[PDB]
Amino acid sequence: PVFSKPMDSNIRQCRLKKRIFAAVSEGCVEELVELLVELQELCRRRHDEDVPDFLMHKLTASDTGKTCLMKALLNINPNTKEIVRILLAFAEENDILGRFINAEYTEEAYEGQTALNIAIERRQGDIAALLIAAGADVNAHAKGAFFNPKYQHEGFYFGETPLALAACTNQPEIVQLLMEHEQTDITSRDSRGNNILHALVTVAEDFKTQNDFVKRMYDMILLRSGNWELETTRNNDGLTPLQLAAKMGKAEILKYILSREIKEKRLRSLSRKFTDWAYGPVSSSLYDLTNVDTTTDNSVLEITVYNTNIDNRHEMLTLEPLHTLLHMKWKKFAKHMFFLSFCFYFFYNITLTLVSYYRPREEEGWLQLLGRMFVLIWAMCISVKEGIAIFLLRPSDLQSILSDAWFHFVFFIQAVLVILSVFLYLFAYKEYLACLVLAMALGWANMLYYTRGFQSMGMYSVMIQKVILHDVLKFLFVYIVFLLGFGVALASLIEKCPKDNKDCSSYGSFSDAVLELFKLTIGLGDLNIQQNSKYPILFLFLLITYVILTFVLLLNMLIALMGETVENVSKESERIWRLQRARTILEFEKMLPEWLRSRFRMGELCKVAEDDFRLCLRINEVKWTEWKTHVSFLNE
Amino acid sequence: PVFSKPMDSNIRQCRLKKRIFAAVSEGCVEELVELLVELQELCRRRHDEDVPDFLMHKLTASDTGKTCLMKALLNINPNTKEIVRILLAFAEENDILGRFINAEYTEEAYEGQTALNIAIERRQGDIAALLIAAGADVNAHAKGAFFNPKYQHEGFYFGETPLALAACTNQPEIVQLLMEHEQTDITSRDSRGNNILHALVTVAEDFKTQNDFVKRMYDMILLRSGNWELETTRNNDGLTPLQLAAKMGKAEILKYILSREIKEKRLRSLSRKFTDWAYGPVSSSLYDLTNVDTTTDNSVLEITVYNTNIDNRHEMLTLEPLHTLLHMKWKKFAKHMFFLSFCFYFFYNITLTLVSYYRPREEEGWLQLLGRMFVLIWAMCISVKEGIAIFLLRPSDLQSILSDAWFHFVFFIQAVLVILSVFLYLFAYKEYLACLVLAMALGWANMLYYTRGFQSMGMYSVMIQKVILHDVLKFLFVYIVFLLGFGVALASLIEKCPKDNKDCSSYGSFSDAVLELFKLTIGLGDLNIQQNSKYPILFLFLLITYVILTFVLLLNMLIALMGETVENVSKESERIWRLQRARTILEFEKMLPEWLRSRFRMGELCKVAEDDFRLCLRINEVKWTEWKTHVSFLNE
Ligand SMILES: CCCCCCCC/C=C/CCCCCCCC(=O)O[C@@H](COC(=O)CCCCCCCCCCCCCCC)COP(=O)([O-])OCC[N+](C)(C)C
Ligand SMILES: CCCCCCCC/C=C/CCCCCCCC(=O)O[C@@H](COC(=O)CCCCCCCCCCCCCCC)COP(=O)([O-])OCC[N+](C)(C)C
Ligand SMILES: CCCCCCCC/C=C/CCCCCCCC(=O)O[C@@H](COC(=O)CCCCCCCCCCCCCCC)COP(=O)([O-])OCC[N+](C)(C)C
Ligand SMILES: CCCCCCCC/C=C/CCCCCCCC(=O)O[C@@H](COC(=O)CCCCCCCCCCCCCCC)COP(=O)([O-])OCC[N+](C)(C)C
Ligand SMILES: CCCCCCCC/C=C/CCCCCCCC(=O)O[C@@H](COC(=O)CCCCCCCCCCCCCCC)COP(=O)([O-])OCC[N+](C)(C)C
Numbered sequence A, B: 001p002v003f004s005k006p007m008d009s010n011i012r013q014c015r016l017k018k019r020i021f022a023a024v025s026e027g028c029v030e031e032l033v034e035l036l037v038e039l040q041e042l043c044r045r046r047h048d049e050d051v052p053d054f055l056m057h058k059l060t061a062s063d064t065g066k067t068c069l070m071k072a073l074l075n076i077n078p079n080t081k082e083i084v085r086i087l088l089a090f091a092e093e094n095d096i097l098g099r100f101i102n103a104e105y106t107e108e109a110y111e112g113q114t115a116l117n118i119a120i121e122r123r124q125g126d127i128a129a130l131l132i133a134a135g136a137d138v139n140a141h142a143k144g145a146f147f148n149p150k151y152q153h154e155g156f157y158f159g160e161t162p163l164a165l166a167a168c169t170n171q172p173e174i175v176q177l178l179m180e181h182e183q184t185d186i187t188s189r190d191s192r193g194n195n196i197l198h199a200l201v202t203v204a205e206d207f208k209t210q211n212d213f214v215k216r217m218y219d220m221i222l223l224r225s226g227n228w229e230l231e232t233t234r235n236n237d238g239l240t241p242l243q244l245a246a247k248m249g250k251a252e253i254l255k256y257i258l259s260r261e262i263k264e265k266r267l268r269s270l271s272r273k274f275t276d277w278a279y280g281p282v283s284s285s286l287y288d289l290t291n292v293d294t295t296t297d298n299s300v301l302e303i304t305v306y307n308t309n310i311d312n313r314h315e316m317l318t319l320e321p322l323h324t325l326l327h328m329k330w331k332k333f334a335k336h337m338f339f340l341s342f343c344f345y346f347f348y349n350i351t352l353t354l355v356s357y358y359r360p361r362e363e364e365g366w367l368q369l370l371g372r373m374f375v376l377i378w379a380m381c382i383s384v385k386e387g388i389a390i391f392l393l394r395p396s397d398l399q400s401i402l403s404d405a406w407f408h409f410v411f412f413i414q415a416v417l418v419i420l421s422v423f424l425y426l427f428a429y430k431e432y433l434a435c436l437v438l439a440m441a442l443g444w445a446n447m448l449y450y451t452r453g454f455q456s457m458g459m460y461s462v463m464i465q466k467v468i469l470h471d472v473l474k475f476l477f478v479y480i481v482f483l484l485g486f487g488v489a490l491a492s493l494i495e496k497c498p499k500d501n502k503d504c505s506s507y508g509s510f511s512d513a514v515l516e517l518f519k520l521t522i523g524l525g526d527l528n529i530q531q532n533s534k535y536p537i538l539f540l541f542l543l544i545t546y547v548i549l550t551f552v553l554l555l556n557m558l559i560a561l562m563g564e565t566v567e568n569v570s571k572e573s574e575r576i577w578r579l580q581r582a583r584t585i586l587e588f589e590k591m592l593p594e595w596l597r598s599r600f601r602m603g604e605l606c607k608v609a610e611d612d613f614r615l616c617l618r619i620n621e622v623k624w625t626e627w628k629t630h631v632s633f634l635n636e
């Protein structure tokens, strides 16, 4: 990144004020005392009306706003605490201690950063305790391009508050010192709208390491708060800390929140998992479904399934209510809607076939009327439905067209070519055969959409798409190099044939020469040596050189590259069809009306505590492997 | 190796002097005292004019120059220190202690080795302290074929000085004893021109192990020197210890020197990295660019990119100023010069194509004149530019023609065949078509040079070259064995055909028989059994035997060997295009004039200290992963 002005500067890029910053940096105590006396006497020699203002302009930098207190804290030495006790005592007789401890940068990239923001970051618990006990602001919002970047490489976002700075830098002794302070606003929201619990989700990691202080900071702040105000708070985008963990793909944080159970009464009401009974490996629990089920707009189940930015959707959709809601919707409507979508579309491809095969060749019942009117209606049903999904779609397709958004185009292109064949055949035109045949060939080719979501057949549609997009299209630029180079080369040697006998040279034009050289590449060629040219040996040299390069080397090079794609999909094949069915379920739920979706709703009302009635889900879990390993070491 | 004379010898390959060497070896003290009295009395029985000379010829070997003091130190026993104290006291009454402790080998392979060179190597800190306190030379240069070899298997190079012997054999207690000695010349240069810091680079290793004493010896000697005299010293080849680490490929040493930062004032001026400010994971530093940027002749960036001898160029070009200078040159001129080199060469291949396809067949505008004159100029621009690069190139091509120096020939051969086609077409000749077509086919084939340096397309040009050079050409000697063996075999059975009907046997000659047997190998053949010979079954046996060997076994054996090459390049594919672009940048910088290269220069003048103004580079680094692991264990 770049900021065009440093935070601290001690190297110059090629007199009372400049010596004070050169005294608080190295740690010269006896020099700093002699310099402050020279500035204490320099207040009254010309005026006594402006004492509190003139004392501040000689201790602050006029370009950044950095004070002499900030300069001592940016440069940590073992003589640091002695400098702070002198500078805070110097503002006592001048009565300027109120504005000296609450100063901030006036520069646009570090605006709002105070001396308390530096002392907590340098791990100075004794110095930060002296500032708060003197009048430092515990609610100072450090804005700016450095503290509020646009990406995670152009600064450092922690939450803009001193409570979020100690929480993100693993310092719980300062968090306990700030939460006991009665002027600290815990539920404060920064420029992003994030509170103390949104900012911990942002700095969290995606997987489980050895030390997880973010989960420890999440539990410590939430239980000492003792309310739901931090959890129901939404951002400027309208996201809770539960929904933010699903958006950014933090599976360890999303697992902890969504099965949080507190056994202690006076603290039990802050739970989302409620175990009813347990007997060995069998447990029965109640799970909160407040923002999880798809009854609100931006629900957690809708985020995780449609989150193409992240890599761990299979880890997050295996979690504790998310796998059961996804399974119960399949056994109620989504298996029925997938079977009928197969049946109405397989009947649609047969009717396209039997009107394309039995077309009126030269001369130009109730079941025949039932067939052709079904073609005109079902093609308009797809072109409206798939046309909305393309319009409601963003142009950054590198992550959505993996297996998902590729089918939204080919069902739409096939539906338009059926409709375009109607306008051509009826009016006056003969180009209907060019549109009806290509729609029928693409119509049968779209039957591989119904192989998706199954353990045995789900990986075949991914193998076809990933070979075309990642192996074949990047290999056309290697092969057209040799197809167009040798194509003009062999066509230039062919002499103009004497008048008759058009089968005297197959390479007699550039359009001819590309055809046979494509046949030598795939192996349907002919090494003809008749070939009436003035250079028979030179034609025979470039013809065999083409066969060795394309057929022997470049053809088997592509097969070795396509074979690496097939084995990579086959290793991930158990994770593919589980994510294919998960998107198929939620698209079928959006096709349902409101009166029918209300019958399909899961959940029952519970009595958690006094004035607490939330929507639950009873999930009977049995864990044999986790039980046998648990019992074994209690009696080793 | 071989030296034809040993250092120490105790085994004979099938009388006062020979008993002394047989006394200092085993450790006989009471025998050695009785032998020295017999030699003390043998000085005066025939002359008293030559006492200091005659006392030395009976204690030294006349063939090697080895003394009795060296013989006791080569044979370490627990009775070693008692022998040294007697022999050094024996030279006191004879007043020959000055030449007895400073003696050396007169043999050509061990010349200059003294008793101090042996005592430090055998780990004798007490014996080496007694020699220096008696008058031993601390600046004795041990030359010779053993101590100055030509390769790293024909001797032991350490630096030829006793200070470099204790530094390379991990003995810092003797290094501290030598650097406090006021006659020790630290900045001494041996026969190679190496000083104390060049010799540590030579004995260093390429990667990071558990114990790195070479980096510890580099830091200990440099900080106690306290000057830049050891760093600015160049060899006989003109290399600093910074440039020697880039030449020999020591990435651990080159990383330590190029980000050396000393926080301590009185020692800060020996730094090359200067951290300006740090706030969490974000750091801003200034890097020294004295011999790093390409403004001097033998710069570190020019060495590492063009160092085909080493295997770790990707590890060294990732380092701390080397990755930023390589990235800033791409975003200023090298991306523009690569795009226009694509555009002027793609226009050049079209104009060659449209004059080769539309040639005057039988009978023999301003845009047509603009095209053909562009061919005559652009072919002369390549033939001059690529002709210099072949002339300035060494004949040891096994490491430069991997992906790099192969393109310097094929752009040159293509440019000459365009020029050769002009002299043939204009004068009187008809062989212009044999040169224009082969230049046009090779001209389109050189378009894969512009796929280099990209993450998606950079590995394809390496896969084509490595399959030809390492799989195909070593398999021709396997296949011509079977092509020439069966080719004469099947042509010898073919009887001379009765007069007419030339299509009676396709194997009627050796030139004919190689053609169809090449077609059976690739799979375009015919198992014809008509074949008018006197041995129809014996012809049919050798024909099917050829198909099973070549098409079934030897063809798929090559495909299995080519497939191992493709998967090895595909695993290294992220390291290939980063090294392809790095050579493309520095070749474009050499094409720039001096006035335009001065505008593209990076760096600003800094004030490091008093009388210290060097060229810097501000690099804003952010390290999220290295910060989250660092904070986690400080508050575990
Ligand atoms: C303009 C357009 C408008 C469109 C109108 C639509 C909009 C309005 C829609 C309204 C619909 C209303 C909702 C549906 C409610 C029905 C309830 C039901 O029975 O569902 C059931 C399915 O029932 C079945 O019979 C499934 C049959 C087997 C399917 C096999 C999948 C393969 C499909 C072909 C692929 C071949 C692959 C080969 C290669 C290609 C649910 O499943 P289950 O059986 O209950 O689960 C068993 C568990 N249990 C019994 C314990 C509970
Ligand atoms: C997944 C998808 C896989 C498959 C998709 C692949 C699809 C590929 C399909 C290919 C089929 C090709 C059909 C050709 C049709 C005729 C063309 C023509 O007119 O040529 C004419 C000139 O011929 C020349 O001289 C060629 C010169 C072209 C210049 C090349 C620049 C662009 C190439 C960029 C590449 C470099 C990039 C480098 C990057 C590394 C010859 O004309 P004619 O034939 O003799 O006509 C007879 C005239 N008559 C009819 C009146 C008698
Ligand atoms: C890359 C891996 C390499 C190894 C693996 C190989 C497999 C992959 C390789 C793929 C490379 C593709 C090479 C195709 C060769 C075309 C031949 C040709 O020129 O056509 C004809 C020209 O016809 C025309 O005049 C109009 C052009 C129509 C050509 C359409 C062909 C398919 C296009 C793309 C299909 C997309 C499919 C996508 C499926 C995923 C032949 O000419 P003619 O009619 O005989 O001459 C008439 C005479 N005249 C001169 C008087 C005019
Ligand atoms: C090793 C892997 C094995 C398995 C994989 C296989 C792939 C790799 C294998 C490679 C092996 C190569 C075998 C080629 C077969 C030659 C056929 C021949 O003899 O030509 C002709 C002779 O014509 C002549 O008389 C002049 C010679 C021209 C030959 C040029 C062929 C290409 C040369 C090298 C190209 C370099 C390309 C390099 C690309 C990287 C045929 O003879 P005829 O004209 O029909 O007879 C005339 C009649 N007469 C008897 C009266 C005279
Ligand atoms: C006799 C012979 C004499 C020869 C005369 C020459 C000698 C004298 C020469 C003198 C030249 C002087 C130096 C150049 C100064 C220009 C400045 C510039 O804009 O550079 C810029 C290029 O900007 C572009 O225009 C790049 C366009 C895209 C290139 C894509 C690469 C693919 C190229 C084809 C591959 C196809 C592969 C397909 C398969 C093959 C630098 O990049 P950038 O944009 O700045 O980077 C963005 C960063 N920034 C904007 C934030 C800063």
Ligand SMILES: CCCCCCCC/C=C/CCCCCCCC(=O)O[C@@H](COC(=O)CCCCCCCCCCCCCCC)COP(=O)([O-])OCC[N+](C)(C)C
Residues within 6 Å of the ligand: B472, B473, B476, B477, B478, B480, B481, B484, B488, B509, B510, B511, B512, B514
């Ligand atoms: C990457 C590159 C890949 C591709 C490149 C590969 C390129 C290969 C290309 C190959 C094409 C070959 C074309 C042949 C041209 C004619 C030759 C000839 O005249 O033969 C004659 C004798 O025939 C014999 O008897 C052969 C004996 C040769 C001795 C071999 C020793 C050296 C081989 C060392 C090997 C062992 C080493 C062992 C180590 C393991 C027959 O002549 P004719 O045919 O009857 O002519 C008709 C005469 N007339 C015209 C007047 C009528």
Ligand SMILES: CCCCCCCC/C=C\CCCCCCCC(=O)O[C@@H](COC(=O)CCCCCCCCCCCCCCC)COP(=O)([O-])OCC[N+](C)(C)C
Residues within 6 Å of the ligand: A343, A344, A346, A347, A350, A351, A354, A355, A358, A359, A360, A367, A368, A370, A371, A372
């Ligand atoms: C998986 C769930 C299944 C979903 C529903 C699927 C069920 C679909 C079932 C029926 C769909 C058809 C209804 C469309 C009505 C119009 C038909 C038409 O075009 O007329 C044709 C009549 O038909 C024939 O005679 C064709 C005979 C070959 C059909 C092959 C059987 C396979 C498809 C069928 C069975 C598939 C069974 C699938 C499994 C049940 C014209 O034929 P003609 O007599 O020659 O007329 C003369 C025309 N001429 C003058 C130009 C020559």
Ligand SMILES: CCCCCCCC/C=C\CCCCCCCC(=O)O[C@@H](COC(=O)CCCCCCCCCCCCCCC)COP(=O)([O-])OCC[N+](C)(C)C
Residues within 6 Å of the ligand: A534, A535, A536, A537, A538, A539, A541, A545, B413, B431, B434, B435, B438, B439, B441, B442, B445
């Ligand atoms: C891949 C794209 C580039 C293709 C190669 C381009 C590079 C070439 C670079 C330099 C070549 C320069 C010399 C050739 C010019 C004269 C040729 C000639 O006149 O033909 C002669 C022989 O015909 C032949 O068989 C010639 C063989 C071609 C030479 C290829 C070099 C070997 C490289 C192999 C590597 C394999 C290729 C690369 C694989 C890695 C004439 O025979 P004729 O026809 O019977 O005519 C009779 C009339 N006349 C005698 C009066 C004339």
Ligand SMILES: CCCCCCCC/C=C\CCCCCCCC(=O)O[C@@H](COC(=O)CCCCCCCCCCCCCCC)COP(=O)([O-])OCC[N+](C)(C)C
Residues within 6 Å of the ligand: B343, B344, B346, B347, B350, B351, B354, B355, B358, B359, B360, B367, B368, B370, B371, B372
């Ligand atoms: C990526 C950056 C691009 C860099 C610049 C690339 C731009 C290059 C643009 C133009 C290059 C041409 C300039 C050379 C001028 C001489 C041409 C010539 O020989 O005359 C030919 C005229 O031309 C034709 O009529 C040929 C038509 C087929 C061309 C196919 C288009 C692809 C290449 C072009 C477009 C590529 C576009 C690429 C993308 C922009 C001869 O044809 P004729 O009428 O039959 O004459 C009769 C002769 N006869 C009597 C013997 C038969």
Ligand SMILES: CCCCCCCC/C=C\CCCCCCCC(=O)O[C@@H](COC(=O)CCCCCCCCCCCCCCC)COP(=O)([O-])OCC[N+](C)(C)C
Residues within 6 Å of the ligand: B534, B535, B536, B537, B538, B539, B541, B545
């Ligand atoms: C690889 C390079 C070397 C190739 C093998 C060399 C080694 C051979 C070593 C020893 C062979 C010694 C005996 C052969 C001599 C007489 C043959 C004969 O006369 O033909 C007879 C039959 O023709 C046949 O089919 C015979 C089979 C060929 C013999 C191969 C041995 C089996 C090895 C298998 C291993 C596979 C090979 C190796 C694969 C690993 C006659 O039939 P005719 O033709 O119709 O003529 C009729 C007229 N007449 C009856 C009057 C005659």
Ligand SMILES: CCCCC/C=C\C/C=C\C/C=C/C/C=C\CCCC(=O)O
Residues within 6 Å of the ligand: A410, A413, A442, A445, A446, A448, A449, A460, A461, A462, A464, A465
């Ligand atoms: C507006 C039309 C533009 C031109 C049309 C371009 C693309 C659509 C046409 C074909 C694309 C798909 C072809 C089907 C072939 C293989 C995929 C099998 C289905 C699967 O993946 O399992």
Ligand SMILES: CCCCC/C=C\C/C=C\C/C=C/C/C=C\CCCC(=O)O
Residues within 6 Å of the ligand: B410, B413, B442, B445, B446, B448, B449, B460, B461, B462, B464, B465
């Ligand atoms: C003086 C001439 C001597 C004879 C010529 C010998 C060799 C040069 C000719 C051809 C070599 C290159 C051919 C191109 C074919 C495949 C490589 C693709 C480009 C790449 O590598 O990606």
Ligand SMILES: NCCOB(c1ccccc1)c1ccccc1
Residues within 6 Å of the ligand: A313, A314, A315, A317, A318, A323, A326, A327, A328, A330, A578, A579, A581, A582
């Ligand atoms: N057979 C249980 C596999 O789990 B399922 C699953 C697991 C992880 C991610 C997505 C889904 C599942 C499959 C179909 C319907 C509901 C859930």
Ligand SMILES: NCCOB(c1ccccc1)c1ccccc1
Residues within 6 Å of the ligand: A337, A338, A340, A341, A344, A381, A382, A385, A411, A591
């Ligand atoms: N919207 C018109 C057809 O939509 B359906 C559909 C079309 C293509 C892919 C998937 C579904 C459909 C959905 C449920 C039952 C029957 C058909």
Ligand SMILES: NCCOB(c1ccccc1)c1ccccc1
Residues within 6 Å of the ligand: B313, B314, B315, B317, B318, B323, B326, B327, B328, B330, B578, B579, B581, B582
């Ligand atoms: N995109 C960062 C990859 O690093 B680059 C790189 C890394 C190691 C070796 C060589 C280069 C790089 C790539 C292009 C220009 C400059 C540097």
Ligand SMILES: NCCOB(c1ccccc1)c1ccccc1
Residues within 6 Å of the ligand: B337, B338, B340, B341, B344, B381, B382, B385, B411, B591
């Ligand atoms: N020297 C004549 C052609 O050189 B250029 C060139 C040609 C082939 C490969 C690499 C470079 C060139 C360089 C920059 C811009 C345009 C062309």
Ligand code: NA
Residues within 6 Å of the ligand: none
């Ligand atoms: Na394999």
